[PDB]
Enzyme design. Structure first.
Site, PDB file in Angstrom:
ATOM      1  N   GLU A  11      -5.764 -10.582   7.307  1.00  0.00           N
ATOM      2  CA  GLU A  11      -5.380  -9.182   7.121  1.00  0.00           C
ATOM      3  C   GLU A  11      -4.140  -8.744   7.874  1.00  0.00           C
ATOM      4  OE1 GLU A  11      -6.854  -7.311   5.073  1.00  0.00           O
ATOM      5  OE2 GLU A  11      -8.899  -8.159   4.741  1.00  0.00           O
ATOM      6  N   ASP A  20      -2.020  -1.505   0.790  1.00  0.00           N
ATOM      7  CA  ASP A  20      -2.596  -2.829   0.650  1.00  0.00           C
ATOM      8  C   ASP A  20      -2.182  -3.507  -0.672  1.00  0.00           C
ATOM      9  OD1 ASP A  20      -4.234  -1.708  -1.241  1.00  0.00           O
ATOM     10  OD2 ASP A  20      -6.129  -2.105  -0.213  1.00  0.00           O
ATOM     11  N   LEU A  32      -9.075   0.287   5.142  1.00  0.00           N
ATOM     12  CA  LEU A  32      -8.706   1.217   4.059  1.00  0.00           C
ATOM     13  C   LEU A  32      -8.865   2.666   4.482  1.00  0.00           C
ATOM     14  CD1 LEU A  32      -8.098   1.857   0.961  1.00  0.00           C
ATOM     15  CD2 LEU A  32     -10.503   2.073   0.757  1.00  0.00           C
TER      16      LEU A  32
END
Ligand SMILES: [Cl-]
Ligand SMILES: [Cl-]
EC number: 3.2.1.17
Length: 162
Positions: A11, A20, A32
């Site tokens: 990530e 993203d 998120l």
């Protein structure tokens, strides 16, 4: 290698709001913020998550805190999920990290939906599961990451991350 180091490779750890792979506002290690197209909405969600007026920027510690919370929540989601728990319980330590990774990325509901792959994993049919896992939007959209996780389920080692 451990789950945090693994997800950190997958990530990253951005300190400013970013979009993203799906175009959604996110921050830190894949946290998120919102699916809404509004930067303002994102900033709002961010301030609420951190508990201060951030102006879209957080510190490293703040990013790591969100990370810790998110890993913890993925594990607890698995454990409470009737379809996921039995799979997790059946796996070895390395493969458990791979399941956590998928949950972190796509949510419990999303993973719980890979019915056939889950059955295969539970049965320890490694190569079969790996093939089934690849037949998915997940693999087509984020192939490199998906390949790393699949290899992890296939081999039970961290080779894909070294
Ligand atoms: Cl939060
Ligand atoms: Cl990828």
């Amino acid at each position: 290698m451990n789950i945090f180091e693994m997800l950190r490779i997958d990530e990253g750890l951005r300190l400013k709001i970013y979009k993203d792979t799906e175009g959604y506002y996110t921050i830190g290690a894949g946290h998120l913020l919102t699916k809404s197209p509004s930067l303002n909405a994102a900033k709002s969600e961010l301030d609420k998550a951190i508990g201060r007026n951030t102006n879209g920027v957080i510190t490293k510690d703040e990013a790591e805190k969100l990370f810790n919370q998110d890993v913890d929540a993925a594990v607890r989601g698995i454990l409470r999920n009737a379809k996921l728990k039995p799979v997790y319980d059946s796996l070895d330590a390395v493969r458990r990290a791979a399941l956590i990774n998928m949950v972190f990325q796509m949510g419990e509901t999303g993973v719980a939906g890979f019915t056939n792959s889950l059955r295969m994993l539970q049965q320890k049919r490694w190569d079969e599961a790996a093939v089934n896992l690849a037949k998915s939007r997940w693999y087509n959209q984020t192939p490199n990451r998906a390949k790393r996780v699949i290899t992890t389920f296939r081999t039970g080692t961290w080779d894909a991350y070294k």
